Amino acid sequence: PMDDEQVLRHLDQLVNDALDFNSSELSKQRSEALKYYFGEPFGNERPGKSGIVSRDVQETVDWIMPSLMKVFTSGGQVVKYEPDTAEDVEQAEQETEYVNYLFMRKNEGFKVMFDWFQDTLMMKTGVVKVYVEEVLKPTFIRKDKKKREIKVLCVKPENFLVDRLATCIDDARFLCHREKYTVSDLRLLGVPEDVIEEANREVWASECYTLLDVDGDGISELRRILYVGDYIISNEPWDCRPFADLNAYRIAHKFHGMSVYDKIRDIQEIRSVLMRNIMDNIYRTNQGETPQLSGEVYGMLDRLEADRGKRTGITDRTRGAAMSVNQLMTAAEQQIDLIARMFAETGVKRLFQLLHDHAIKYQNQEEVFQLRGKWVAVNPANWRERSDLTVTVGIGNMNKDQQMLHLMRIWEMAQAVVGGGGLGVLVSEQNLYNILKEVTENAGYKDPDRFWTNPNSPEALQAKAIREQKE
Amino acid sequence: PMDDEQVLRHLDQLVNDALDFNSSELSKQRSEALKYYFGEPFGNERPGKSGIVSRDVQETVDWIMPSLMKVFTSGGQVVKYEPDTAEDVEQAEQETEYVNYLFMRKNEGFKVMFDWFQDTLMMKTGVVKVYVEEVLKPTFIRKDKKKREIKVLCVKPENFLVDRLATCIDDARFLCHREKYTVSDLRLLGVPEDVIEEANREVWASECYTLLDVDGDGISELRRILYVGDYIISNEPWDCRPFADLNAYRIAHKFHGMSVYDKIRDIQEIRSVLMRNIMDNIYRTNQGQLSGEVYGMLDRLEADRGKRTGITDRTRGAAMSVNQLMTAAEQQIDLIARMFAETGVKRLFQLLHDHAIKYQNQEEVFQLRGKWVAVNPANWRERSDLTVTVGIGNMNKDQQMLHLMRIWEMAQAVVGGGGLGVLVSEQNLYNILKEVTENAGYKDPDRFWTNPNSPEALQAKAIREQKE
């Protein structure tokens, strides 16, 4: 109650506790992960002998990364909102394209997600920060003044000090994000002085999202504290925590989740060690009766590779009548697809965070959403639900299976309908429109390349009645 | 009779006894399961030697997740109600897709079922709690006042203190669920003070569904009590207990059933010890032989781990492989899904009850527009999920293919030999192609084809053929 300075010391204590715990545990875990990944010697390699370390989680990354790269970055249909059917065309799909086109091609593209994945799969925590800035260069026509933007960036979760007692984004009572915020930022804030820490003061700062009792009242909101060095802070009633804290496997009830490294490292160890010993033995046979090594010791390298596969990418090779429907059922219900489902579900919260941060106030600007025109997106509704089920282990029938099945069954059935029944008696041009439209989107081009609409229009009067009933 | 404070003491001692028994037994079992699963050294690995643990249950878990995910999380047809056929189209499938659409994509998605599986396969007890809340943002058009919701959340069965003498949900006379219910929830309830346990008071609380007599009368209904810290409680009559307490294998009569751990643990232990011993012997030979058949029985161990749960040694070990090799070689995990759905029938009844008492006036997204308030459904007291699992339960990939083939063949045969109208007609050939459209993935829109008796039907089945 009435806390204005004890909050600073309590936040310092919480920051120090997060330092100790998160730094020690997670930094040691991610350092082991990095040491295994980079393939530098483990430290047990004696001088005078080839200390060969075989990188095995690297190809694991080279395997997991492409599949996810296809699965997410394919159209702006990855995450719909699925609100009521009435207000779909004007705000569901419009806001969906708004958020996708402001994320894809307008928030750095996918490389932010790329580094996010690497953070959750190499450095054991995938988490990013969303915040706001302004735009300048007014007409001084070219009136661009006070234009606001909202954008996301990787936090380097080593600089994401937090208690482990959250296990989810909306459970951390104390979120500390570490930054530099150098002398230029100090001048912009207005602090005339500095802290212990020349424009290169390499000053360090912390942003704390935390809840306490500072007024002697009910449950206070989250508060954003720019606790830098116990100096002039930027405290503000915060509303939404802009982070995601992935774990890469939906591990048990703890904040930081085990890495892919943790489930591949052992394989790598064995692999490296054994091949070392093998050529080591080969070496001790060259220099010189030392028993020789048959080719069978190399045979279990194959089962080690199979273990590396079947851990996540259960297909040992690239991909291990009806032409193997759905691409052998999404490559045999791949574990990567399950993790992709998890990641899309986690990013649903992020899309909500951005939808909020733009529905408060972003700008009045329109969309290039297949057409010209979009009202101000500082007043859309969140709808509280973002639907992304059709991308992954769910229905998720991928393009090169759904499209081929649709084209084949649709064409054969439509020709049967035309020959036997006809066009207008059964499904007509206006619905055959949609029926071939599925092909058009699955061909990649819906609106501009394939207009096809002809619903009820100056064309439709002469493309469905005047043309047909007169002839 | 006349119990106001002795109820608190009785619930405290019940909570303490449940802590003792459940904590000890289930916690030790689930800790052994977690230590086997996570693959950390068992503790017998002496320093100076590689304490490698061959995780052999993790592949079992990663195998049983996806099959359950397809068999349960697929469409709104997982659990029908099979009521009287008169009120079939009026309420049966309407409420079926209602609870499906509120449970999937509206009740946390499927992740609650994922944690449910985990609760029953390394926490050894798959149990969750269903409860209610309210909705806000009124007119301050946009009238959102007193709107209510019903939802299910996992209870972390360590925090599901309960007598083991139940063996089923509707058998426990004392179901205690441990929560935190911190100072925020204390302020919401209205308590001015706290207990022994600064906003971070980390207070602990318990919700008890118990049967007691406090009035000196006949049989009393269940009571929900918010015994927190021997302090103010939230007592309320309770109608239906919202828990599931899975066992994952339909074990003999005990509340908490054996895990997938209890049946793959032997395989994992044998695998780990022999692989460690093989590398140890290799190292002693290197510093100063072993036959290769020790690695040969690694395959036998993998097959034993399969046969235990995933009985096919491989992923799945004329007539085009009828029913996908007789329902995936009549999988045991299919039986697990069967009893999982049987247990979730009670959960769906709980949800339907809690929404039928009062949820909201909102309309369904069940393939159409138009549905009255779902505070007046009929539960039908039976939730039919027979077309999903070890029952009839044929999978789509085989059923749709064979049925489309038979539809094509018999439709062509009837057209050629008998005709199109004297036998099964266009309006029934509608349905006959409609199951094909159903299993194609899209139900209503892309294949409407209705043509029953309508302005499109009058020119589509009446005058387009008899007058031409």
Side-chain angles (χ1 to χ4, degrees), chain A residues 1-138 147-471, chain B:
Chain A
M2 283 73 74
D3 299 334
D4 199 7
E5 186 60 33
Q6 84 95 24
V7 289
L8 277 72
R9 62 186 37 79
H10 166 257
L11 262 62
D12 204 300
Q13 168 263 332
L14 273 192
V15 161
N16 297 312
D17 195 3
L19 283 166
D20 174 72
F21 184 81
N22 201 6
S23 306
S24 315
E25 266 79 4
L26 268 297
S27 290
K28 91 183 183 292
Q29 289 163 99
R30 69 199 60 240
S31 63
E32 291 151 351
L34 187 71
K35 183 261 288 183
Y36 276 38
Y37 178 93
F38 264 49
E40 84 261 29
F42 309 132
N44 47 60
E45 323 286 338
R46 73 279 191 190
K49 194 57 68 71
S50 73
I52 299 307
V53 162
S54 175
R55 309 135 159 85
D56 195 88
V57 307
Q58 300 193 346
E59 63 253 31
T60 302
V61 180
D62 308 342
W63 270 121
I64 62 171
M65 262 302 167
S67 302
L68 164 59
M69 278 315 143
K70 277 75 70 177
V71 74
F72 182 76
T73 66
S74 55
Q77 61 273 2
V78 57
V79 175
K80 194 190 177 295
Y81 296 161
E82 202 261 327
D84 185 74
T85 74
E87 60 91 22
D88 269 336
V89 65
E90 61 90 21
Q91 276 185 353
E93 282 77 1
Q94 277 274 346
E95 289 302 302
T96 293
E97 194 276 341
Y98 199 89
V99 301
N100 286 125
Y101 174 53
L102 191 149
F103 181 75
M104 271 305 118
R105 301 164 304 286
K106 290 220 299 291
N107 287 128
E108 204 274 331
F110 70 95
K111 170 53 195 179
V112 298
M113 294 183 287
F114 184 91
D115 263 342
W116 185 20
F117 311 144
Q118 271 171 336
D119 282 349
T120 192
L121 62 93
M122 293 298 102
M123 81 176 268
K124 283 202 61 177
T125 296
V127 65
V128 288
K129 170 176 165 287
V130 192
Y131 77 114
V132 301
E133 275 183 354
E134 56 96 25
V135 192
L136 278 178
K137 188 262 291 180
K147 273 74 183 171
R148 290 217 307 110
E149 66 90 21
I150 305 96
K151 63 189 177 303
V152 63
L153 74 164
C154 293
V155 300
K156 193 64 175 66
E158 281 177 357
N159 302 326
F160 189 51
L161 295 174
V162 71
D163 50 350
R164 209 198 192 93
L165 316 175
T167 312
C168 200
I169 188 63
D170 47 357
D171 203 14
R173 282 81 63 195
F174 150 70
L175 292 91
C176 182
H177 170 59
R178 294 163 62 85
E179 291 275 329
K180 281 310 273 206
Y181 296 161
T182 190
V183 193
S184 161
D185 307 346
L186 308 180
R187 198 140 296 108
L188 266 294
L189 193 148
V191 289
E193 310 315 304
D194 63 322
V195 290
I196 174 63
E197 299 146 346
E198 171 82 6
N200 187 4
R201 274 165 197 86
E202 61 87 20
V203 63
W204 206 290
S206 81
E207 170 160 19
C208 185
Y209 296 154
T210 181
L211 73 165
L212 291 174
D213 48 353
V214 303
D215 306 322
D217 56 348
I219 298 99
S220 81
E221 215 180 3
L222 273 175
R223 304 296 321 280
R224 157 177 196 196
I225 311 297
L226 203 57
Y227 155 60
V228 175
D230 277 320
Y231 195 31
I232 295 171
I233 61 189
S234 309
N235 45 1
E236 165 205 356
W238 211 242
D239 44 3
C240 47
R241 32 187 72 183
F243 299 99
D245 51 52
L246 281 174
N247 49 6
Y249 283 102
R250 202 62 264 165
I251 304 94
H253 295 90
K254 73 186 163 80
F255 184 89
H256 297 274
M258 61 79 71
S259 179
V260 304
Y261 153 79
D262 294 323
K263 57 158 52 184
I264 312 296
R265 58 90 174 173
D266 57 356
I267 312 297
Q268 171 163 300
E269 278 300 298
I270 302 156
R271 213 182 202 90
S272 299
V273 167
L274 65 90
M275 65 184 73
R276 202 177 309 118
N277 288 326
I278 292 156
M279 81 204 98
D280 284 327
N281 203 1
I282 296 304
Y283 292 164
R284 82 174 62 104
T285 57
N286 184 21
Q287 55 92 213
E289 179 51 48
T290 297
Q292 271 189 326
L293 272 181
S294 46
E296 59 92 19
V297 293
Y298 283 158
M300 61 65 58
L301 277 173
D302 185 74
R303 62 90 172 174
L304 264 192
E305 177 63 35
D307 293 331
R308 183 225 71 81
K310 272 79 171 175
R311 183 56 51 81
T312 65
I314 65 174
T315 72
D316 46 356
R317 192 69 174 86
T318 51
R319 207 200 44 80
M323 41 75 68
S324 284
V325 297
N326 206 351
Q327 290 75 27
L328 213 58
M329 187 66 204
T330 318
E333 59 192 356
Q334 200 45 66
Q335 168 66 254
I336 319 299
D337 205 356
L338 319 163
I339 305 305
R341 159 85 279 168
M342 182 179 72
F343 274 36
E345 291 290 317
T346 307
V348 166
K349 144 87 168 178
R350 291 292 86 202
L351 293 174
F352 169 71
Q353 167 77 63
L354 277 296
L355 197 155
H356 160 275
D357 287 317
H358 290 88
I360 171 169
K361 176 77 187 68
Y362 167 70
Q363 197 58 37
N364 306 314
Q365 62 91 33
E366 73 170 2
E367 287 176 30
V368 180
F369 171 37
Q370 301 158 5
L371 60 84
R372 173 153 290 281
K374 159 66 178 70
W375 76 299
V376 57
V378 312
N379 296 310
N382 51 0
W383 321 117
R384 190 62 271 173
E385 191 256 327
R386 281 74 55 199
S387 69
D388 48 356
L389 173 71
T390 49
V391 182
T392 185
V393 177
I395 296 297
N397 286 114
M398 62 80 71
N399 197 309
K400 300 290 94 175
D401 163 67
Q402 197 277 334
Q403 168 47 35
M404 61 79 70
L405 282 177
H406 185 93
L407 68 86
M408 61 79 71
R409 84 175 295 275
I410 281 301
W411 195 237
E412 64 95 17
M413 168 177 154
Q415 299 316 122
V417 163
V418 172
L423 175 58
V425 57
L426 290 177
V427 65
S428 70
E429 180 190 295
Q430 196 43 40
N431 207 342
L432 204 71
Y433 166 70
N434 318 106
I435 289 171
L436 295 156
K437 263 303 189 191
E438 289 98 10
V439 180
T440 71
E441 292 84 4
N442 287 291
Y445 42 92
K446 171 194 74 174
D447 194 27
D449 198 80
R450 311 264 76 90
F451 64 95
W452 290 28
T453 177
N454 210 354
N456 272 315
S457 51
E459 71 254 46
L461 57 86
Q462 52 92 21
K464 290 179 180 177
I466 283 173
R467 49 97 183 178
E468 198 176 20
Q469 314 317 121
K470 290 182 174 64
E471 63 96 21
Chain B
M2 184 278 288
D3 300 338
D4 53 352
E5 184 64 30
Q6 82 97 27
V7 286
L8 280 73
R9 300 285 76 77
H10 161 253
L11 261 60
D12 201 300
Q13 63 84 30
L14 268 187
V15 165
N16 293 312
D17 186 74
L19 287 171
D20 177 71
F21 182 76
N22 207 6
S23 305
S24 314
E25 264 81 3
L26 268 295
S27 289
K28 74 97 177 178
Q29 284 163 100
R30 72 194 56 229
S31 63
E32 289 154 352
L34 194 73
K35 182 264 289 181
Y36 276 36
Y37 182 91
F38 270 46
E40 83 261 31
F42 312 133
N44 50 60
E45 320 286 336
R46 74 276 188 193
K49 195 57 71 74
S50 74
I52 300 306
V53 164
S54 175
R55 305 143 157 89
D56 195 86
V57 309
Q58 297 184 346
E59 61 250 34
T60 304
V61 179
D62 304 342
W63 282 23
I64 64 179
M65 291 305 148
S67 294
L68 296 169
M69 281 316 163
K70 273 77 71 177
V71 69
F72 292 132
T73 76
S74 59
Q77 61 270 5
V78 65
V79 165
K80 201 182 182 293
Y81 293 158
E82 203 260 327
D84 44 352
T85 58
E87 266 76 17
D88 209 340
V89 299
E90 196 69 29
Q91 280 96 8
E93 53 263 23
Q94 283 273 341
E95 281 302 300
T96 289
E97 209 281 331
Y98 184 81
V99 302
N100 286 303
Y101 167 63
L102 195 145
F103 203 63
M104 294 299 291
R105 305 172 304 284
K106 286 177 70 176
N107 265 21
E108 204 274 332
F110 77 99
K111 174 48 194 163
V112 295
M113 283 73 74
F114 184 86
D115 284 336
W116 193 20
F117 305 152
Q118 270 168 335
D119 287 341
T120 196
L121 66 91
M122 73 290 291
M123 283 73 74
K124 294 199 61 177
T125 294
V127 64
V128 289
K129 182 173 172 288
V130 190
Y131 79 116
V132 311
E133 275 187 353
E134 57 89 20
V135 183
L136 294 174
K137 187 262 290 180
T139 54
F140 287 99
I141 311 173
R142 74 281 191 191
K143 291 179 176 180
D144 284 343
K145 273 183 175 185
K146 306 169 183 176
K147 274 77 182 170
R148 290 214 304 109
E149 66 91 18
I150 297 92
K151 66 184 178 300
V152 61
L153 75 164
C154 295
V155 311
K156 186 62 173 67
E158 293 179 353
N159 304 327
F160 184 54
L161 322 170
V162 68
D163 43 351
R164 206 199 190 94
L165 58 86
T167 312
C168 200
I169 179 59
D170 54 357
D171 291 331
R173 64 146 293 284
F174 154 69
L175 295 94
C176 180
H177 167 57
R178 290 165 67 84
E179 286 276 328
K180 281 313 276 207
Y181 294 160
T182 189
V183 192
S184 160
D185 302 341
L186 305 179
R187 196 146 296 111
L188 192 143
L189 195 148
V191 293
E193 308 313 305
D194 62 323
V195 291
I196 178 64
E197 304 148 348
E198 168 80 7
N200 191 2
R201 275 170 197 90
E202 61 87 20
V203 64
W204 206 290
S206 83
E207 168 156 16
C208 182
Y209 297 154
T210 181
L211 197 144
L212 268 179
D213 58 356
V214 302
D215 306 323
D217 56 348
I219 296 91
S220 80
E221 186 178 2
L222 278 174
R223 306 298 322 280
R224 155 179 195 198
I225 312 296
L226 203 56
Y227 157 59
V228 175
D230 283 319
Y231 195 72
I232 299 168
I233 60 187
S234 310
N235 46 1
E236 173 204 359
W238 194 246
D239 48 359
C240 58
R241 34 190 74 180
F243 300 98
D245 50 54
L246 284 175
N247 47 1
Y249 282 101
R250 200 67 268 165
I251 298 90
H253 291 88
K254 70 189 164 82
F255 188 95
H256 306 271
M258 61 79 71
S259 178
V260 304
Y261 155 73
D262 291 322
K263 65 191 291 183
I264 321 292
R265 55 102 180 169
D266 44 350
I267 313 299
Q268 176 159 302
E269 283 304 295
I270 296 159
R271 213 184 202 92
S272 300
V273 301
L274 66 87
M275 61 76 59
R276 203 175 310 119
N277 291 320
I278 288 155
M279 65 183 73
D280 287 329
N281 262 345
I282 282 298
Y283 283 117
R284 279 83 59 84
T285 56
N286 182 21
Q287 58 92 32
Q289 266 192 324
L290 61 83
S291 64
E293 56 94 20
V294 286
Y295 283 167
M297 61 79 71
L298 271 175
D299 185 24
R300 196 211 160 109
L301 289 178
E302 187 65 34
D304 290 331
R305 168 222 55 76
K307 182 262 289 181
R308 197 57 54 79
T309 61
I311 64 171
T312 69
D313 51 355
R314 191 62 180 169
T315 46
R316 188 59 49 188
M320 71 155 258
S321 72
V322 292
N323 301 107
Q324 283 94 24
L325 202 59
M326 291 155 168
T327 311
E330 53 203 354
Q331 196 47 58
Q332 165 66 255
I333 315 303
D334 205 351
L335 315 164
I336 309 313
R338 155 81 275 172
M339 41 76 68
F340 273 9
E342 285 291 317
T343 305
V345 160
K346 152 89 169 179
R347 290 298 90 227
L348 265 178
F349 169 68
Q350 171 76 63
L351 270 299
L352 195 156
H353 172 96
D354 285 319
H355 291 93
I357 180 168
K358 173 73 186 68
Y359 167 69
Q360 199 55 41
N361 304 314
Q362 61 88 31
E363 198 261 325
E364 285 185 23
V365 176
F366 167 43
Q367 298 167 7
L368 58 92
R369 179 165 293 276
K371 161 68 179 69
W372 61 97
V373 54
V375 311
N376 296 315
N379 47 0
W380 318 113
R381 276 77 62 199
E382 190 276 331
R383 280 74 58 202
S384 73
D385 46 358
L386 282 76
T387 49
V388 176
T389 182
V390 191
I392 297 296
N394 196 359
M395 292 79 97
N396 197 308
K397 280 79 184 174
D398 186 75
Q399 188 274 331
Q400 171 47 41
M401 186 66 204
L402 294 174
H403 203 91
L404 70 86
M405 294 299 291
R406 83 170 301 276
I407 297 300
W408 197 242
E409 72 93 21
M410 73 178 184
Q412 298 305 131
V414 168
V415 169
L420 186 57
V422 63
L423 261 188
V424 59
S425 66
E426 186 183 302
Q427 189 43 41
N428 210 345
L429 213 66
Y430 169 71
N431 297 114
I432 283 176
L433 300 161
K434 255 289 190 183
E435 70 275 16
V436 175
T437 72
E438 181 67 26
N439 292 296
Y442 48 89
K443 289 82 177 174
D444 199 27
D446 198 68
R447 315 265 84 83
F448 65 106
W449 272 60
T450 185
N451 204 339
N453 271 313
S454 56
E456 71 256 50
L458 299 186
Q459 53 88 21
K461 217 174 302 170
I463 62 170
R464 49 93 181 171
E465 204 171 19
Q466 308 316 118
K467 292 181 174 64
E468 55 94 20

